[PDB]
Amino acid sequence: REIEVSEPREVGITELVLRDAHQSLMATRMAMEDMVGACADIDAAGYWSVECWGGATYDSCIRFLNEDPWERLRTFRKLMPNSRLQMLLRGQNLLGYRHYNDEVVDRFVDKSAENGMDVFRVFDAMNDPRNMAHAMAAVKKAGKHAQGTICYTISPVHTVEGYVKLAGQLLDMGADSIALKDMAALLKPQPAYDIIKAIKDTYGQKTQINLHCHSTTGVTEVSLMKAIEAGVDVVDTAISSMSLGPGHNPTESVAEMLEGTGYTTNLDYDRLHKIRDHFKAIRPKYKKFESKTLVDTSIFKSQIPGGMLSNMESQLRAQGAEDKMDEVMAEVPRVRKAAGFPPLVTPSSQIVGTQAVFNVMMGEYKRMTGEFADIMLGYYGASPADRDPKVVKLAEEQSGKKPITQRPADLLPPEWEKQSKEAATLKGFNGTDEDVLTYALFPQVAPVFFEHRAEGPHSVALTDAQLKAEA
Amino acid sequence: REIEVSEPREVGITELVLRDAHQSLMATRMAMEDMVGACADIDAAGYWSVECWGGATYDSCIRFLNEDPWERLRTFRKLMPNSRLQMLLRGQNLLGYRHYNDEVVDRFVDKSAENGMDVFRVFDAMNDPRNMAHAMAAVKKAGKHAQGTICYTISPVHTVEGYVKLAGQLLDMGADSIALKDMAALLKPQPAYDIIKAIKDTYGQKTQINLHCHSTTGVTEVSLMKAIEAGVDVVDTAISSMSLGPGHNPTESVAEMLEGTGYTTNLDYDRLHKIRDHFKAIRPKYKKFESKTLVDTSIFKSQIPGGMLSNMESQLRAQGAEDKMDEVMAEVPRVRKAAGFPPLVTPSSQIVGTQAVFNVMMGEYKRMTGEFADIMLGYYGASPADRDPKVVKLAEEQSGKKPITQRPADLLPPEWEKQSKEAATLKGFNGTDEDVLTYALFPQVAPVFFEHRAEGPHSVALTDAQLKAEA
Ligand SMILES: [Co+2]
Ligand SMILES: [Co+2]
């Protein structure tokens, strides 16, 4: 019995400590002040890229830290001059709350690249390539690296062949590399090997694939080893003092585990040690935002991500039917199916979760939320599988909207000029496209932020004094 | 490029939640009251064995919980009637502070088996087979399972061939199985595969090997997968709510990661879920005893286990030279070498660590502790490599003891009758061999314990009230 493994080679590593690590472990509340001190070492560690922007950090900066996201980007570009900066961008949704007209996507990408972003990991919650298409083109126009993304999930319609097809569609829209995202740590070892190998066998060894796995279920570092045996080019990790739990596998652990296998990373262990210790000293200040579960494999049976489960709980707590949780968890699968089995990541997870609670309370689709209606009617794009025509009809007969099947942005009219005018009437607006984008992405937060931005970035973390006083 | 892997098969699992998990995560303070509620589910989970005795639990029971270790054993045998109970026994040292005469080993093993112990994992801190020989024979006489142990470590003298030789010596003394112990999580993936495969190739596939790895460095779950590909029969894990950090890899994670690989475990996921939730509800009460580091790979460079490092720190704090820590960490390697490269596990780690601090302060072996002197003079047994003759001489010229090279217990005279007499003069002594053993193993604690035992077992964990009041 034998297993074919890739030839001895160097495996690239993407550090997530500056973005996804704290987004996953301390609600994206990491203050810029607590990160800049590790930039010099991070820049000289030897990482393939440094994820430090995008995701929920834009929202967090303006909503909780009174920090300008564009200033964070500029500072990181300046303190890590020799590194490839990387961000996560939700396609046509950008970092916003809805799909935007193509010109807004163009502006955003152009300004991101202009301010220093090198690698753009573009993804769509439902894996609809059409929603990633324009952002990808904008990234290529800016001469930057376009990383098309495949959100991994487990469902009756997701298969290896299905993932290989998506990889092809991403390569067809000019992807420079393919990212396999596993936000819920659902990727097991064998599937990791099979999917990576199938993509490499189908499109060629030159096809660059970056694997992003969280450690929530505790099985993905083994998946990382299997992905490396299958030939994956780069794997995402988080410095050891900011890893595990709903976060990611440890950078140092992944580097150390390869000794003697023929595979290696070229990270500087001394630099890694300094970055570790830097965050180990700072992490305690964020205890009020930490999660309390290091390993949870329940999703392999329920299909429900811990985050999604908590939300439904709170929704079943604030109403009075905490007794129907076992019923809700049984309803979710049915709602997911009806919606076409979309991956259960934001926002699909909230939409499916909330609708599941309604069906239990008010009754079988008796009342559909505005979001669920939009998903069923195709306003978020195509689903991995065909949506239940019966539930679709009900959505149409309850929202008054006609079902659509083409890229949603095709219906969106130009809005930049409209956004610029409205933004320019806000006290604090600095007249840059960056600020207009801030208003376009977060209309209800931009006002307050522009007004207080002059006060400078803050921190919602405990102070050393508060740490001591508490101890 | 290919890698040979074992044929599809069932992999056995040993659950550590009742012994090593809490010894490693909350200073062995887990109260019997907090464990008995999960016994029924643990007994029906499908584990190959349940480690629930030995190690530091005997000391903890009588020193901190006013609990009779023998009563804990009897209760576990009664609540888990269909399971193979397993314990850790430090050979000729038993669970005590020194080597004992062979008749004490006979008594202990006989009473352990009589009270219900099924599998005895016998080990010696310096991997000297002669110190394991008699316990192993006693285990075989009692008709129980003798698991000879190899303490894994990394040193210039430890090699695959060296481990294969030890495995042979263990099999020659009647071992029913071989345990590979990696208390510091030093076993990387390739070495795990190479050592397991070499033992299987040399002594036959019928040779049973159980792998015990902690997760301290964060690389051992990958090692577990490699060990399984190499053909390991059983791997030790800890239920997910009591895992990771200086503890072990998660039971559920290890079981889930095998899906589709051809390997499988036959654990009942529902029973595992109940055991998880049981301990998740109880673990918060032990926060005052939790460690604060989930992943630490520094040992791959320093050879110093976190626990060993902390101790030296405190010793360098309580004296005034916290400035010489970088010097101490540089001295340890030299002391280890001089001692013959013994694995850095208790008590060798403390002995080497303390001596390292002296050499830095008072000077190069200017003053040797009584323990270090005994190691250098062979009173703990043979070292993996020859000890520095120059340091040996100094030990002899400073302790007045002649160096020995034969099994230390060969010099020990009968002591049972002496132990019985002394023990019988303690208020509370119940006249059983069990109590005499308690006195023989912990002379200075037995008095206090026998006097308060009637008050019943206690807990040093926070009460629900204290948990709430604190929150
Ligand atoms: Co992520
Ligand atoms: Co252990």
Written as one string, the DSSP assignment of B131-197 is HHHHHHHHHHHTT-EEEEEEE----TT--HHHHHHHHHHHHHTT-SEEEEEETT----HHHHHHHHH
Mark whether B140 and B152 lie in a shared domain.
Answer: yes
Which chain residues have CB less than 5 Å from ligand 1, an ion? A 20, 183
- Residues of chain A contacting B235 with CB distance shorter than 8 Å: none
Q: Is residue A2 part of a domain?
A: no
Interface test with chain A among B186, B226, B257, B286, by most A beta carbons within 10 Å: B257
Measured CA to CA, the distance from residue B3 to residue B402 in angstroms comes to 51
In which element (H, E) is residue A88 found? Answer: strand A85-89
Longest dimension (CA), chain B: 70
Q: In Å, what is the CA distance from B268 to each residue of B212, B242, B253, B275?
A: 21, 18, 13, 11
Measured CA to CA, the distance from residue A467 to residue B333 in angstroms comes to 36
The partner residue sitting opposite A225, judged by closest CB among B225, B243, B296, is: B225
Contact B249 A218 (CB under 8 A): yes
Q: CB within 8 A of A330, min separation 6: which ones?
A: none
Measured CA to CA, the distance from residue A330 to residue A269 in angstroms comes to 47
Q: Does B191 touch chain A (CB under 8 A)?
A: yes
A89: helix, strand or coil = strand
Count of helix runs (H) and strand runs (E) in chain B? 21, 11
Q: Shortest Cα distance from A214 to chain B (angstroms)?
A: 13
Query: Is residue B377 within 8 Å of B402, Cβ to Cβ?
Result: yes
Pull the structure tokens for residue A335.
């709602």
Q: CB within 8 A of B290, min separation 6: which ones?
A: B25, B26
The partner residue sitting opposite B257, judged by closest CB among A1, A189, A262, is: A189
CA quadruple B139, B145, B150, B151: dihedral sign: negative
Measured CA to CA, the distance from residue A30 to residue A40 in angstroms comes to 18
Measured CA to CA, the distance from residue B188 to residue A299 in angstroms comes to 29
Mark whether B104 and B161 lie in a shared domain.
Answer: yes
Pull the structure tokens for residue A280.
């180990």
The whole domain housing B321 covers 292-471
Measured CA to CA, the distance from residue B94 to residue B96 in angstroms comes to 5
Q: Is residue B218 part of a domain?
A: yes
Measured CA to CA, the distance from residue A382 to residue A399 in angstroms comes to 18
Measured CA to CA, the distance from residue A428 to residue A461 in angstroms comes to 26
For helices B348-360 and B325-338, angle between their N-to-C axes, nearest 10 degrees: 120
> DSSP per residue over B219-280, as a string?
-HHHHHHHHHHTT-SEEEEB-GGG-STTSB-BHHHHHHTTTTSSEE----HHHHHHHHHHHH
Q: CB within 8 A of B60, min separation 6: which ones?
A: B23, B27, B28, B29
Q: In Å, what is the CA distance from B236 to each residue of B102, B199, B440?
A: 30, 19, 31
Q: In Å, what is the CA distance from A386 to each residue of A99, A154, A405, A418, B95?
A: 21, 16, 11, 36, 64
Number of domains chain B contains: 2
Residue type, B164: V
CA quadruple A458, A462, A467, A469: dihedral sign: positive
Q: Is residue B133 part of a domain?
A: yes
Contact A261 B296 (CB under 8 A): no
The dihedrals phi and psi of B121, each to the nearest 5 degrees, come to -85, 105
Measured CA to CA, the distance from residue A411 to residue A341 in angstroms comes to 25
- Residues of chain B contacting A229 with CB distance shorter than 8 Å: 3
Q: Pseudo-torsion of CA B51, B54, B56, B62, nearest 10°?
A: 120
Phi-psi region of B345 (alpha: psi -120 to 50; beta: other; left: phi over 0): beta
Q: Is residue A3 part of a domain?
A: no
Residues in chain A: 471
Mark whether B378 and B401 lie in a shared domain.
Answer: yes
Contact A253 B301 (CB under 8 A): no
| Nearest CA-CA partner of B177 in B207, B221, B202 | B207
**Pairing between strand A9-10 and B9-10?**
unpaired
Interface test with chain B among A217, A221, A280, by most B beta carbons within 10 Å: A221
Contact B295 A223 (CB under 8 A): no
Query: Is residue A105 within 8 Å of A416, Cβ to Cβ?
Result: no
| Nearest CA-CA partner of A399 in A380, A381, A372 | A372
Residue type, B193: Y
Q: In Å, what is the CA distance from B201 to each residue of B1, B6, B196?
A: 21, 12, 9
Among B291, B315, B343, residue at a domain's last position: B291
**Pairing between strand A9-10 and A263-264?**
parallel
Mark whether B281 and B317 lie in a shared domain.
Answer: no
Q: Is residue B2 part of a domain?
A: no
The dihedrals phi and psi of A320, each to the nearest 5 degrees, come to 120, 0
Count chain A–chain B contacts defined by CB atoms under 8 A: 133
Q: CB within 8 A of A288, min separation 6: which ones?
A: A461, A462
Q: Does A265 touch chain B (CB under 8 A)?
A: no
Longest dimension (CA), chain A: 70
**Vertex B469, ends B466 and B471: CA angle to 5°?**
110
Measured CA to CA, the distance from residue A147 to residue A345 in angstroms comes to 19
Measured CA to CA, the distance from residue B3 to residue B1 in angstroms comes to 7
Residues in chain B: 471
The partner residue sitting opposite B253, judged by closest CB among A2, A4, A297, is: A297
Q: Does A221 touch chain B (CB under 8 A)?
A: yes
Mark whether B340 and B302 lie in a shared domain.
Answer: yes
Q: In Å, what is the CA distance from A193 to each residue of A222, A257, A296?
A: 10, 17, 22
Pull the structure tokens for residue B175.
């071992």
Burial A175-184 (b: 16+ CB within 10 A, else e): bbbbbbbbbb
Query: Is residue B95 within 8 Å of B128, Cβ to Cβ?
Result: no
H helices of A320-432, where? 325-338, 348-360, 370-376, 389-399, 416-423
Pull the structure tokens for residue B341.
């490269």
Measured CA to CA, the distance from residue B243 to residue B283 in angstroms comes to 11
Contact B221 A217 (CB under 8 A): no
Ligand nearest to the CA of B152: 2
| Nearest CA-CA partner of B289 in B51, B462, B37 | B462
A141: helix, strand or coil = helix
The partner residue sitting opposite A257, judged by closest CB among B4, B219, B258, is: B219
Among B265, B291, B317, residue at a domain's last position: B291
A87 pairs with which residues across the strands?
A: A53, A120
B150 pairs with which residues across the strands?
A: B180
Cβ atoms within 10 A of the Cβ of A417, count? 10
Residue type, B359: N
Distance B256 CA to ligand 2 centre (A): 22
Q: Is residue B65 part of a domain?
A: yes
Q: Does B235 touch chain A (CB under 8 A)?
A: no
Q: Does A160 touch chain B (CB under 8 A)?
A: no
Q: CB within 8 A of A58, min separation 6: which ones?
A: A69, A95, A441, A442
- Residues of chain B contacting A1 with CB distance shorter than 8 Å: 4-8, 262
Burial B368-404 (b: 16+ CB within 10 A, else e): beebbbbbbbbbbbbbbbebbeebbebbeebbeeeee
Ligand nearest to the CA of A24: 1
Residue type, B96: G
The partner residue sitting opposite B188, judged by closest CB among A3, A222, A259, is: A259
Mark whether B338 and B376 lie in a shared domain.
Answer: yes
Across A252-349, the runs of DSSP E, i.e. the strands, are 263-264
Burial A297-313 (b: 16+ CB within 10 A, else e): bbbbeebbbbbbbebbe
Q: Is residue B3 part of a domain?
A: no
Among B244, B272, B291, residue at a domain's last position: B291
Mark whether A281 and A324 lie in a shared domain.
Answer: no
Measured CA to CA, the distance from residue A238 to residue A241 in angstroms comes to 8
Query: Is residue A208 within 8 Å of A178, Cβ to Cβ?
Result: yes
Mark whether A100 and A216 lie in a shared domain.
Answer: yes
B470: helix, strand or coil = helix
Query: Is residue B235 within 8 Å of B211, Cβ to Cβ?
Result: yes
Query: Is residue A69 within 8 Å of A34, Cβ to Cβ?
Result: no
Q: Does A191 touch chain B (CB under 8 A)?
A: yes
CATH code: domain of residue A110: 3.20.20.70
Mark whether A219 and A144 lie in a shared domain.
Answer: yes
Measured CA to CA, the distance from residue B406 to residue A273 in angstroms comes to 44
Name the percent of chain A in helix, strand, coil, to the closest 5: 50, 10, 40
User: Which residue has tokens 């930049």?
Assistant: A416
Mark whether B304 and B219 lie in a shared domain.
Answer: no
Mark whether B50 and B151 lie in a shared domain.
Answer: yes
Q: In Å, what is the CA distance from B448 to each residue of A200, A213, A224, B426, B451?
A: 68, 53, 53, 9, 5
Measured CA to CA, the distance from residue B248 to residue A236 in angstroms comes to 23
Cβ within 8 Å of A, B 298-337? 298, 300-301
Ligand nearest to the CA of B345: 2
Measured CA to CA, the distance from residue A69 to residue A96 in angstroms comes to 13
Q: How was this structure determined?
A: X-ray
Pull the structure tokens for residue A188.
């097991």
Peptide bond into A347 cis (omega under 30): yes
Mark whether B264 and B324 lie in a shared domain.
Answer: no
Query: Is residue B385 within 8 Å of B127, Cβ to Cβ?
Result: no
**Pairing between strand A2-4 and B2-4?**
antiparallel
Q: Is residue A1 part of a domain?
A: no
Closest-CA residue of chain A to B4: A2
Contact B295 A243 (CB under 8 A): yes
In which element (H, E) is residue A439 found? Answer: helix A433-441
Q: Does A470 touch chain B (CB under 8 A)?
A: no
A121: helix, strand or coil = strand
The partner residue sitting opposite A7, judged by closest CB among B1, B240, B243, is: B1
